[PDB]
Design an enzyme around this catalytic site. Structure first.
Site, PDB file in Angstrom:
ATOM      1  N   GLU D  36     -28.311  37.250  77.539  1.00 36.67           N
ATOM      2  CA  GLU D  36     -27.830  36.856  76.217  1.00 36.67           C
ATOM      3  C   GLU D  36     -27.415  38.110  75.464  1.00 36.67           C
ATOM      4  O   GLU D  36     -28.227  39.016  75.281  1.00 36.67           O
ATOM      5  CB  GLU D  36     -28.929  36.157  75.428  1.00 36.67           C
ATOM      6  CG  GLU D  36     -29.193  34.722  75.827  1.00 36.67           C
ATOM      7  CD  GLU D  36     -30.272  34.072  74.966  1.00 36.67           C
ATOM      8  OE1 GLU D  36     -30.512  32.854  75.110  1.00 36.67           O
ATOM      9  OE2 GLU D  36     -30.884  34.778  74.141  1.00 36.67           O
ATOM     10  N   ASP D  47     -33.747  35.426  61.437  1.00 33.28           N
ATOM     11  CA  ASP D  47     -33.547  35.788  62.831  1.00 33.28           C
ATOM     12  C   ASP D  47     -34.758  36.493  63.432  1.00 33.28           C
ATOM     13  O   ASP D  47     -34.817  36.708  64.646  1.00 33.28           O
ATOM     14  CB  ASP D  47     -32.308  36.684  62.958  1.00 33.28           C
ATOM     15  CG  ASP D  47     -31.577  36.498  64.288  1.00 33.28           C
ATOM     16  OD1 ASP D  47     -32.233  36.557  65.353  1.00 33.28           O
ATOM     17  OD2 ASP D  47     -30.340  36.299  64.270  1.00 33.28           O
TER      18      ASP D  47
END
Ligand SMILES: *Cc1c(COP(=O)(O)O)cnc(C)c1O
Ligand SMILES: *Cc1c(COP(=O)(O)O)cnc(C)c1O
EC number: 4.2.1.20
Lengths: 385, 241, 385, 241
Positions: D36, D47
């Protein structure tokens, strides 16, 4: 010039003409339709009157005593009831055809109030202030200058308020023809003690109507702090003939009545004649003014209004005291509990009303006069606490 | 209550100490036709910086009301020059009008002026004053209407004291004197802030029965303290020519 | 959740449930009789609503143009319109059965407003603030603590607002069950942009009624400053369907549009998607947020409410800018001329309204939204000037 | 889109620089079943601190969108390991959905996850994604209702990404349980793995893939350009080799 045996017009002959003329003017405008029309106009659209009567639901229940209402004078433009009197005298001065306003200030509160009103009505404003206080009040001096007034530092004598007062008086005696002297409280020679009270009666009037609307009846007690006594007189007056209503004044107990560090003139002073009035003053053994103290600037005064001395005498009003520590507690409490930061002066009334409420039944009513917001006292508090 | 053309000195009792005041009085006595003695007050009102400061000095050094009477009584052992006591109302109120006036008379005081007691409020005072053998002294200012002026004169048994709104003597001050002489039956003493010989001359010339000299003197007493005696005479001498 | 093409709910899935639930609650209480009854109750007795509509007689004549009226939001408890939204969301959070309020703050204004409302309604208040700002805001931090809230300093990242926002979000995602996240302006994901606007519409409603009472007609122009756009939206909204009425938003021109030192998002930004909304943002050449500037803290924001983007688009409202220097001038002018010290944010609207008034006829009407008092900006000003 | 039981590393493109990212990718490639890659954004939303900080680092060192595609393209010269691009909507919006997806495909990107683009708002996106040959990756959280979970699965062509609200939380396992029991797609989990036991327990519970991001970027934050070796050591620990 009298409230019972108190009051008077004890001043040098040089101040008599200006005073006599002020008496005349106040008489012809006191009830002039046009004058009041404008007075109410500014009080409403500029000052923000009326102020609400707030019910401290959470604070009253926390104490489990009587119900506690607060007259929110902390919401008037400027943050204090002082604005009521400023607008009044400034407008009167304008109607008298004056073009300049002068006053003196210590903490700077009266200074600012005067400056604002002068700006509103377009008048020249000169404010006398001891050089000592000028240094101590950086932000207030700046505020006055922003408002267009010019602060005149006095360095004679102790460079404090007392020295500024004399400079103001001298000024007035020479320029009273076009200059008005704006006294900040219900003190001094006639006709000030009464003129100032009249310009503050709005507080009581509003509060009366308001409490009737909320409770359908008059309050059991009304508590207000007392420095010179103008906010206390303003809310007391309209209730003076309502026998049911108990009136309580709270003076600065400072560090304890038993320590000489206070300003409880009515609760510990002897009658005398100073600042042009016959009233109660914290005097020396030789009839000289004693030094006073209080965490709340506006309460730090060796004297008190003649009308309060009179009310104390005839026992129409009861006067008590609260310590710096107690007022300071109320300061924090009101803040955390009702989300309203009060002025240290007001915190005294809040403090007493709190302990007084505890000794009453859940169906009784207390109205406290929250004379001002405490933004001005953050430094004071932030320091000690 | 003083000879015409007399020079009237003013001193604040207890500045710098009760003894020094007695000394200054004795030293100036010969040049004075009358003397004004001031009793220190914590809160003088628009009394004028120089004098205002003397009050603070006196009280800082622990002055006490009896010390005032002591100075007057002691001075009486040498002179008979008229002594006018000048004080604020509080001390006499705090002690009892008659009681104060009595002690004053007994100390050798001739006249009294209560600085912060309006004419229209001194009815009872002037009354007890007479009965106690004390002459009354009331003051008038430029802004005083001819109306009150008369009333002031009508209650004065000592002399009307004229003072100015604020070293050329203000035009406004002469006008007060003019009207005063033209209206009063009593003698008129002027306190316009004399500082040079020309003032004394011009003022007497204009009808001033007496000319008061206070600031010029207490200013020196403030700069020389206990050692002011000689300088005071020199200055007084200058003023009388 | 859309205002034309703008708005939206652009957030990670972790924030969707809390948001969806907030949408539901707002729907059932938005018009609940009891809810509004209490909302108006606090707005009135605690906040001080309504605020007056003041006619700056002296300022309008000094300019010789159109008439200038000021909506005095500077008089609400707290000194800024922000209090309207604080009370609203806090009350809604209480009805939702929440017990804790959380928010983040830079200058500290929103922090304090939140803290006050939480105290009023008896809720736990945790405020996130970058350690940087905590140092810079001595007095505001103290104010928040006095009000019972506990300020949580964040030291991660730049130790500024951005870092505090993320801390708040993370917090909410984990505690949203009993905690409400109080957004300070008409920004962010749905339903905030619209909820906040609804809680500020009172301003416009009052002003409409008020101007009709004084002039017997609607105003020609309404001018308000725009940061996120909540005070502007609050006064604009009620007049949106009154075609006669011109709406003008004033953004921070800082040191000049031609210097990159400003915050004129609508007058110089590109549309994009940030902070959960599709609106105008001052973006980088690569779609990254650019640094912004303004002498007025509340105007220092790279974005703007979706509803303003929409109004700009359909050209229902015109947006302009004013420099730090101009706003600063208006700051002094209003103070000297009307005796009212405005907040620097508000001074921008006052400034533009002043030059705009000069180009209109003496019979025209301008209403300026004075969003807050300038007590908070004395240091800023005192420094530069 | 990755072999079951695969370990999936996460790195923020440009942290500390575009070259170093390519290096880390190549060094970890052998242990990963898929990778990723995150595109730095100025305003990440909840986040997570460790990752949130990497974004700031990347941008502070002047990262630029093309540099992301460069890393992917360059990596493609050596490996074919699936690459899933993770970015916020703004960059792709600012450039044009189709335009972005096209450049991504061309750079060698296999799948994409738009962090702040709601499922119910990604209809057109998933549509153009298909036409551009890019697999879609949507995420689900513990607070995601079984209802949306289905919809998320129905739009995912790559794999559903499960994340935790904050020892792996009991709440996180429950999400996985439901997910496997509802989704047709493979499921990758990002629960904040930091020790071997996590990887084992999660795979054991049905996780098709286990994402490792914080544990790695935390090292990249402490070692900067010199992180390569430490990253392998940590990855090795997690794989148990
Ligand atoms: C100055 C002040 C006072 C005290 O003066 P009063 O004349 O006794 O009213 C009380 N409250 C506030 C807020 C003040 O500023
Ligand atoms: C914070 C603030 C603003 C700006 O925020 P908006 O959401 O745009 O209203 C404007 N005026 C004042 C007085 C403020 O405190």
């Amino acid at each position: 010039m009298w409230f019972g045996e108190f009051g008077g017009q004890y001043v040098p002959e040089t101040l008599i003409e200006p005073l006599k003329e002020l008496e005349k003017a106040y008489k012809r405008f006191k009830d002039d339709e046009e004058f009041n029309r404008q007075l109410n106009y500014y009080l409403k659209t500029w000052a923000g009157r009326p102020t609400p009567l707030y019910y401290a639901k959470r604070l009253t229940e926390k104490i489990g005593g009587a119900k506690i209402y607060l007259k929110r004078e902390d919401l008037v433009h400027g943050g204090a009831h002082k604005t009521n009197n400023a607008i009044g005298q400034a407008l009167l001065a304008k109607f008298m055809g004056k073009t300049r306003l002068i006053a003196e200030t210590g903490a700077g509160q009266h200074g600012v109030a005067t400056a604002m009103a002068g700006a509103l009505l377009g008048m020249k404003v000169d404010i006398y202030m001891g050089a000592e206080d000028v240094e101590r009040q950086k932000m207030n001096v700046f505020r006055m200058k922003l408002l267009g007034a010019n602060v005149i530092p006095v360095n004679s004598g102790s460079r404090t308020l007392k020295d500024a007062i004399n400079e103001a008086l001298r000024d007035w005696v020479a320029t009273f023809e076009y200059t008005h002297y704006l006294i900040g409280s219900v003190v001094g020679p006639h006709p000030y003690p009464t003129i100032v009270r009249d310009f503050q009666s709005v507080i009581g009037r509003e509060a009366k109507a308001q409490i009737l609307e909320a409770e359908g009846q008059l309050p059991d007690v009304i508590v207000a702090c007392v420095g010179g006594g103008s906010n206390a007189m303003g809310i007391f007056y309209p209730f003076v003939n309502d026998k049911k209503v108990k009136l309580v004044g709270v003076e600065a107990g400072g560090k304890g009545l038993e320590s000489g560090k206070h300003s409880a003139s009515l609760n510990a002073g002897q009658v005398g004649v100073f600042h042009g009035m016959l009233s109660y003053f914290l005097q020396d053994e030789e009839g000289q003014i004693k030094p006073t103290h209080s965490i709340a600037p506006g309460l730090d005064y060796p004297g008190v209004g003649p009308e309060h001395a009179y009310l104390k005498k005839i026992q129409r009003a009861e006067y008590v005291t609260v310590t710096d520590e107690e007022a300071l507690k109320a300061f924090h409490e009101l803040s955390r509990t009702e989300g309203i930061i009060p002025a240290l002066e007001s915190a005294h009334a809040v403090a007493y009303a709190m302990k007084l409420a505890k000794e009453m039944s859940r169906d009784e009513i207390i109205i406290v006069n929250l004379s001002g917001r405490g933004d001005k006292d953050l430094d004071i508090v932030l320091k000690v606490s | 209550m003083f000879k015409d053309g007399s020079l009237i000195p003013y001193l604040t009792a207890g500045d710098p100490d009760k003894q020094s005041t007695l000394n200054f009085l004795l030293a100036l006595d010969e040049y004075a036709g009358a003397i004004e003695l001031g009793i220190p007050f914590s809160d003088p009102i628009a009394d004028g910086k120089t004098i205002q400061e003397s009050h603070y000095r006196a009280l800082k050094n622990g002055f006490k009301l009896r010390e005032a009477f002591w100075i007057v009584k002691e001075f009486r052992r040498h002179s008979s020059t008229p002594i006018v006591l000048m004080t604020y109302y509080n001390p006499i109120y705090r002690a009892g009008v008659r009681n104060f006036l009595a002690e004053a008379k007994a100390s050798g005081v001739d006249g009294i002026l209560v600085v912060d007691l309006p004419v229209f409020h001194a009815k009872e005072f002037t009354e007890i004053a007479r009965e106690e053998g004390i002459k009354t002294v009331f003051l008038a200012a430029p802004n005083t209407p001819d109306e009150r002026l008369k009333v002031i004169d009508d209650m004065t048994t000592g002399f009307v004291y004229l003072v100015s709104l604020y070293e050329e003597i203000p035009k406004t001050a002469y006008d007060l004197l003019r009207r005063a002489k033209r209206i009063c039956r009593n003698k008129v003493a002027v306190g316009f802030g004399v500082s040079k010989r020309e003032h004394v001359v011009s003022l007497l010339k204009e009808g001033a029965n007496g000319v008061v000299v206070g600031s010029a003197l207490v200013k020196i007493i403030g700069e020389k303290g206990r050692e002011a005696t000689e300088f005071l005479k020199k200055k007084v001498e200058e003023l009388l020519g």
